[PDB]
């Protein structure tokens, strides 16, 4: 996360972190329930063996932080690096998460209500332990960042790659705030009356916080049914 601020206690409880073998987080995830984490399909190709940590906010102090092995990985069959289209996956954990301080699931919204009510808000919230500068280092602290929804037309113009209807853009033209490397797979959530609903998955960007470029997110409304089926 470039810009934004550290999540305060209890504020980003659906945040999960994908940790490789050398125990370093490389992607984020979103807690959807006790057994399932939402993440980006493209994260899967940055580790053959990885686990999921929850409850963390500072990777420099080690209570409540907890690691979970992944039992089953459900990658979208239509994902591909060529396009980054369909950039989504669900993980089943081998042992269930116990919800507690800093560990709770985000809500899956109903699709049409989310399109007409969540996606039409001004901003959503993205969070992660990813790099705090494009070339910087990952943050030991969980951070969050308010990101404006950006109009699909503008993002298309702004972009050097094809933005599909399974993607949306959020962020800033020039302001130095964005998600970044290491945030991929993590939550984009939209608050509606004190409740936070999953609206996006950090997916990709040309750099991080670049001028004239935005954050690109998997559009969760496009896959609410797919997640449902993946979780059953």
């Amino acid at each position: 996360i470039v810009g934004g601020q550290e999540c305060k206690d209890g504020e980003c409880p659906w945040q999960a972190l994908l940790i490789n073998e050398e125990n370093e987080g490389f992607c984020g995830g979103t807690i959807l329930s006790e057994f399932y984490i939402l993440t980006a399909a493209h994260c899967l190709y940055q580790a053959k063996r990885f686990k999921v940590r929850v409850g963390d906010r500072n990777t420099e102090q080690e209570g409540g932080e907890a690691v979970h092995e992944v039992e089953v990985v459900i990658k979208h069959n239509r994902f591909t690096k060529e396009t980054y289209d369909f950039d989504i996956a669900v993980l089943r954990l081998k042992t269930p998460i116990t919800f507690r301080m800093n560990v709770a699931p985000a809500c899956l919204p109903e699709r049409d209500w989310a399109e007409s009510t969540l996606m039409t808000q001004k901003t959503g919230i993205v969070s992660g332990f990813g790099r705090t500068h494009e070339k910087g280092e990952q943050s030991t602290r969980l951070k969050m960042l308010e990101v404006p929804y950006v109009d699909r037309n503008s993002c298309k113009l702004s972009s050097s790659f094809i933005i599909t209807q399974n993607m949306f853009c959020a962020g800033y033209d020039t302001k130095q705030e964005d998600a970044c490397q290491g945030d991929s797979g993590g939550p984009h959530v939209t608050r509606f009356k004190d409740t936070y609903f999953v609206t996006g998955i950090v997916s990709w960007g040309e750099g991080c916080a670049r001028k004239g470029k935005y954050g690109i997110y998997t559009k969760v409304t496009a896959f609410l049914k797919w997640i449902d089926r993946s979780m059953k």
Partner: protein, 52 residues
């Protein structure tokens, strides 16, 4: 003739227009209140709520 486009049909969470009226509903882990508008958590860690 009621709409979700005005104060979300007075719903706490999901709103749909049904037979010229609004019907509210809630995410899993919540039960719709008797008043038909509010969403009442059924456990202590309902989705989408910060653990404050």
């Amino acid at each position: 003739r009621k709409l979700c486009s005005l104060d979300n049909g007075d719903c706490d969470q999901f709103c749909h227009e049904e037979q010229n009226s609004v019907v509210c509903s809630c995410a899993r882990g919540y039960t719709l209140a008797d008043n038909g508008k509010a969403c009442i958590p059924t456990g202590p860690y309902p989705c989408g709520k910060q653990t404050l």
